[PDB]
Amino acid sequence: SPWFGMDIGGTLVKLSYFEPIDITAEEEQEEVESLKSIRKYLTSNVAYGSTGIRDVHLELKDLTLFGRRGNLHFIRFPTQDLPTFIQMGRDTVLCATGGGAYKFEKDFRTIGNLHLHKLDELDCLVKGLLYIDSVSFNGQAECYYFANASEPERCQKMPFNLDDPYPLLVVNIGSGVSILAVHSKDNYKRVTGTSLGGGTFLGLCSLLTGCESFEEALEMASKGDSTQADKLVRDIYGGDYERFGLPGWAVASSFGNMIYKEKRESVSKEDLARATLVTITNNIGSVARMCAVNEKINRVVFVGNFLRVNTLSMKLLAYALDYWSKGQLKALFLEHEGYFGAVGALLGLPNF
Amino acid sequence: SPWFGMDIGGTLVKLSYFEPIDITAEEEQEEVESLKSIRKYLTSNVAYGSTGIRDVHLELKDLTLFGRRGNLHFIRFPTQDLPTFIQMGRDTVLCATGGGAYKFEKDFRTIGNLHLHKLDELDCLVKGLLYIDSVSFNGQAECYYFANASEPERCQKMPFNLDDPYPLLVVNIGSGVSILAVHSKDNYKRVTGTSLGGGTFLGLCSLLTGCESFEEALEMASKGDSTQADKLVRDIYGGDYERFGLPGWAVASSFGNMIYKEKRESVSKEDLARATLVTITNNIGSVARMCAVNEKINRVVFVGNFLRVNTLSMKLLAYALDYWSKGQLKALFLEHEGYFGAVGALLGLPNF
Ligand SMILES: Nc1ncnc2c1ncn2[C@@H]1O[C@H](COP(=O)(O)OP(=O)(O)NP(=O)(O)O)[C@@H](O)[C@H]1O
Ligand SMILES: Nc1ncnc2c1ncn2[C@@H]1O[C@H](COP(=O)(O)OP(=O)(O)NP(=O)(O)O)[C@@H](O)[C@H]1O
Ligand SMILES: N#Cc1ccc(N2CCN(C(=O)Cc3ccc(C4CC4)c(F)c3)CC2)nn1
Ligand SMILES: N#Cc1ccc(N2CCN(C(=O)Cc3ccc(C4CC4)c(F)c3)CC2)nn1
Ligand SMILES: [Mg+2]
Ligand SMILES: [Mg+2]
Numbered sequence: 001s002p003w004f005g006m007d008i009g010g011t012l013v014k015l016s017y018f019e020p021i022d023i024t025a026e027e028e029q030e031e032v033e034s035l036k037s038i039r040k041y042l043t044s045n046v047a048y049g050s051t052g053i054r055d056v057h058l059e060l061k062d063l064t065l066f067g068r069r070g071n072l073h074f075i076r077f078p079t080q081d082l083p084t085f086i087q088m089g090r091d092t093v094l095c096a097t098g099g100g101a102y103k104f105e106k107d108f109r110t111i112g113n114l115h116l117h118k119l120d121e122l123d124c125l126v127k128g129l130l131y132i133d134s135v136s137f138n139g140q141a142e143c144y145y146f147a148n149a150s151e152p153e154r155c156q157k158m159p160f161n162l163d164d165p166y167p168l169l170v171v172n173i174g175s176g177v178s179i180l181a182v183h184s185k186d187n188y189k190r191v192t193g194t195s196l197g198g199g200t201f202l203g204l205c206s207l208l209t210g211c212e213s214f215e216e217a218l219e220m221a222s223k224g225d226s227t228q229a230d231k232l233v234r235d236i237y238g239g240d241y242e243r244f245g246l247p248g249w250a251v252a253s254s255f256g257n258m259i260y261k262e263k264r265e266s267v268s269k270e271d272l273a274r275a276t277l278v279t280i281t282n283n284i285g286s287v288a289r290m291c292a293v294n295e296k297i298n299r300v301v302f303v304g305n306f307l308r309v310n311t312l313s314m315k316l317l318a319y320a321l322d323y324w325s326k327g328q329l330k331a332l333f334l335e336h337e338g339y340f341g342a343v344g345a346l347l348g349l350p351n352f
Numbered sequence: 353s354p355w356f357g358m359d360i361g362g363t364l365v366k367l368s369y370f371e372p373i374d375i376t377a378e379e380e381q382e383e384v385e386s387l388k389s390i391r392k393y394l395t396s397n398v399a400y401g402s403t404g405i406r407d408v409h410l411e412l413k414d415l416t417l418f419g420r421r422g423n424l425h426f427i428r429f430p431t432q433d434l435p436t437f438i439q440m441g442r443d444t445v446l447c448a449t450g451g452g453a454y455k456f457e458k459d460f461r462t463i464g465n466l467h468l469h470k471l472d473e474l475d476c477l478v479k480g481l482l483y484i485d486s487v488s489f490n491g492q493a494e495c496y497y498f499a500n501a502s503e504p505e506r507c508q509k510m511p512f513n514l515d516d517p518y519p520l521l522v523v524n525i526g527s528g529v530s531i532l533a534v535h536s537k538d539n540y541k542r543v544t545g546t547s548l549g550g551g552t553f554l555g556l557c558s559l560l561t562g563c564e565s566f567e568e569a570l571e572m573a574s575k576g577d578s579t580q581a582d583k584l585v586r587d588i589y590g591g592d593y594e595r596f597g598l599p600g601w602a603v604a605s606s607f608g609n610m611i612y613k614e615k616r617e618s619v620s621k622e623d624l625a626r627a628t629l630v631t632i633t634n635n636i637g638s639v640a641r642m643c644a645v646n647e648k649i650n651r652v653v654f655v656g657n658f659l660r661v662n663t664l665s666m667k668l669l670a671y672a673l674d675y676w677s678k679g680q681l682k683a684l685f686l687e688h689e690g691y692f693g694a695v696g697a698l699l700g701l702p703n704f
Contacts, residue, residue, distance in 0.1 A: 009588070010583060010587065010588040010604060010605065010608065011608075011611065080612075098588075099585075099588035099589035099590070099593070100588070102589050102590050102591070103588065103589055103590035120595055122595075122596070175583060175588070175604060175605035175608050176583075176603075176604045176605040176606075176608070190596045192638070192642070193598075194635065194638060195582070195602075195603040195604060195605055195606040195608075195631070195634065195635075196548075196606055196631065196635060197605055197606075197608075198605075199583055199604075199605030199606075199607065199608030199611055200605060200606045200607050200608065200631075202608075202610075202611045203581070203605070203606075203607035203608055203609065203610030203611050204556075204607050204610065206610055206611060206613075206616060207560060207607070207610050207616060207624070208559060208560075212613065229555070230547070231362060231527060231528075231551055233451075235362065236361070236362040236450075236451035236452070236455065236527070237451035237454050237455055238451070238454050238455035239454070241451070243472055243474075244474070244542045246545075250547075251528075251547040252362060252527060252528045252547060252551075253362065253527035253528040253547055253549055253550075253551030253552060253555070254528075254547040254548055254549075254551075254552045254555075255551065255552050255555035255556050255559070256362065256363075256527050256528070256547075256549075256551030256552065256554075256555055257555065258554075258555030258556065258558055258559050259363065259551055259554045259555050259558060260432075261558075261564065264558060264559060272559070279547070279548065279552075282547065283546065283547075283548060283635065286544070286546060286639075287638075287639070287642070290544070290639070290642045290643065290646065291642065293646060294642065294645060294646045
């Protein structure tokens with residue numbers, strides 16, 4: 001069978017596919033047409049149907065996995081379109097994680113003789129994260145941070161070494177947020193979570209602005225001024241709140257200037273998109289900061305697809321975590337941030 | 353001069369006024385007409401202008417303060433209308449706190465010879481809270497909790513004793529949220545804050561529903577179903593997430609069902625109001641829970657006017673704090689929850 005890892009989330013399905021590149025002449029003969037058709041279909045297309053995408057830039061080339069050499073591919077499509085995926089399958093052992101491995105278990109079993117093995121969402125995440133960092137990103141670091149995140153003329157992406165990754169706080173920003181404390185390869189726990197995550201950003205943005213994609217919401221936010229919607233410390237005090245070291249630019253009340261009708265009438269869609277992004281991102285950083293202090297962990301890595309093509313939120317997290325922790329916490333990011341559960345699922349294949 | 357305490361917040365001005373009731377016949381002669389006019393105006397009206405309100409039910413009767421007997425009155429009006437208040441004053445020593453004591457300092461000084469003494473927002477809060485609990489609410493408890501907050505047919509407001517109030521976590525829900533750790537009468541600190549507070553509720557509700565008052569937003573929310581907008585754990589998993597003890601009814605992504613256009617087209621304004629209330633209230637409870645665990649404090653008291661006439665949020669906090677802390681934390685509430693800074697300011701009068 002082809003080697004696949006699937007993470008069926010509330011919003012996106014993530015698929016990791018291992019393409020063997022050491023196929024012998026005998027092995028090519030013995031492979032059935034449908035199997036060759038799948039491999040050709042996946043490797044010769046970068047868009048699948050109308051909503052599937054292969055993230056070609058993330059491909060791991062010439063990886064050794066289960067004693068074979070191949071390329072590891074990363075593919076995503078909306079969970080809404082999983083019926084299309086299953087119908088294509090009907091017209092293999094599947095290691096699957098995420099909530100959808102349970103919700104859609106009966107649907108995967110409509111594919112004859114298919115064996116579905118459900119693996120835990122956060123177990124797969126930890127195993128996939130550790131694995132990808134261990135093999136590297138084609139010789140480059142998988143993990144990075146923003147150096148000098150406080151000064152915009154200096155702030156730059158830089159590699160970060162995770163050769164001894166423990167302990168680690170992992171903040172998984174998907175539809176909502178899960179926060180994990182990882183103490184060893186086999187010792188980790190879910191600290192807490194928040195429901196103010198990527199689905200809140202996308203859902204509120206769509207309600208407030210009429211955007212109809214994540215990418216459109218980010219484009220709007222890049223053009224907006226969140227301070228048109230937010231009430232800042234300086235709006236309440238006239239300046240800093242010196243006694244408690246709160247700068248005048250800090251947000252005192254998210255969307256708090258929208259209690260005034262004249263301000264609601266002047267705010268732009270772009271301002272509202274940016275205020276939504278800032279509100280969600282700052283809350284995620286603050287919850288991560290509080291969890292890191294309680295867990296006594298100083299390295300905080302952010303994963304999940306809320307941060308895909310989202311440098312605004314990454315830089316806001318880098319700056320905010322450093323600033324509000326007085327430099328005690330470090331925001332870390334990973335190149336394959338949305339796919340670790342799918343990789344971890346694939347890595348469970350030998351157990352079956 | 354009349355004895356007043358003022359807390360000028362980002363949204364509301366709160367005023368505490370001590371009405372002497374032990375006026376002698378000689379003292380009445382020696383009082384100037386304008387002073388008698390103010391006392392008559394304040395005590396014979398419950399609405400002041402178009403936006404000022406006296407909360408008559410909160411009055412403390414026959415209180416001994418600074419060696420005199422009198423009644424303590426509680427009055428509120430929008431900070432937007434402070435120019436009207438100052439103009440009435442122009443056509444006394446003022447102890448004032450809140451951000452507006454700084455922002456509007458120059459405006460108060462347009463009242464001839466008036467002495468403005470700025471006191472710290474959170475110092476006044478702690479002093480006023482301790483004072484009101486100490487004198488009682490006309491013989492009744494100032495502090496209450498919701499007994500059996502998990503079972504709706506049993507859940508009921510009950511008095512709570514704060515005779516030894518330390519330590520205490522104070523969660524001040526105004527425009528935004530400040531979280532204080534109080535270890536003694538003179539030992540307290542601001543732990544952190546969040547910008548997702550009462551102004552976020554009111555501002556987002558107004559944008560999403562067109563409501564034009566706090567009371568209207570609560571009325572809408574009382575009729576709504578937040579699960580029409582929110583994505584629940586059961587929407588992602590098909591049930592509970594057993595491995596991490598997450599019930600199917602828990603919110604996985606606030607507003608997360610609003611990423612689907614057909615759902616945005618069917619959701620009601622009341623559903624959106626209730627989702628806004630639930631989102632903000634749950635986030636406040638979660639941040640309070642994390643701060644209580646880090647501060648090693650088990651009693652969490654919620655104050656500020658986000659909870660005025662807002663039993664929905666109070667009961668949600670009571671239930672959520674108990675449930676998610678597995679019964680280790682207790683949500684406490686106070687009858688005079690919006691006015692403690694104003695009382696604390698008044699209590700600073702002898703220092704001048
Ligand atoms: N093409 C996209 N479509 C939708 N959302 C996107 C897209 N790209 C990025 N996002 C964001 O990524 C989030 C989903 O991240 P992801 O980590 O894939 O979550 P999920 O696994 O589907 N949800 P969960 O069940 O909570 O783990 C969305 O809420 C958006 O904020
Ligand atoms: N009549 C009202 N008008 C406006 N907001 C109200 C009213 N009644 C209750 N509220 C709520 O109470 C919140 C303000 O609470 P309050 O404790 O008075 O804050 P504030 O002191 O003005 N702000 P801050 O500067 O952050 O301390 C608003 O954000 C609303 O959610
Ligand atoms: N990563 C990370 C990260 C990101 C943000 C963050 N913060 C957010 C801002 N904030 C506040 O206190 C907000 C505030 C300010 C002022 C008042 C009233 C006096 C008016 C409030 F009610 C509330 C500190 C914590 N913390 N961490
Ligand atoms: N007072 C108080 C109080 C109130 C609420 C509260 N919580 C809010 C809910 N919550 C979550 O984890 C939410 C969640 C659930 C599921 C997933 C993914 C698996 C799909 C998430 F990304 C996120 C626990 C903490 N905590 N405290
Ligand atoms: Mg996920
Ligand atoms: Mg206040």
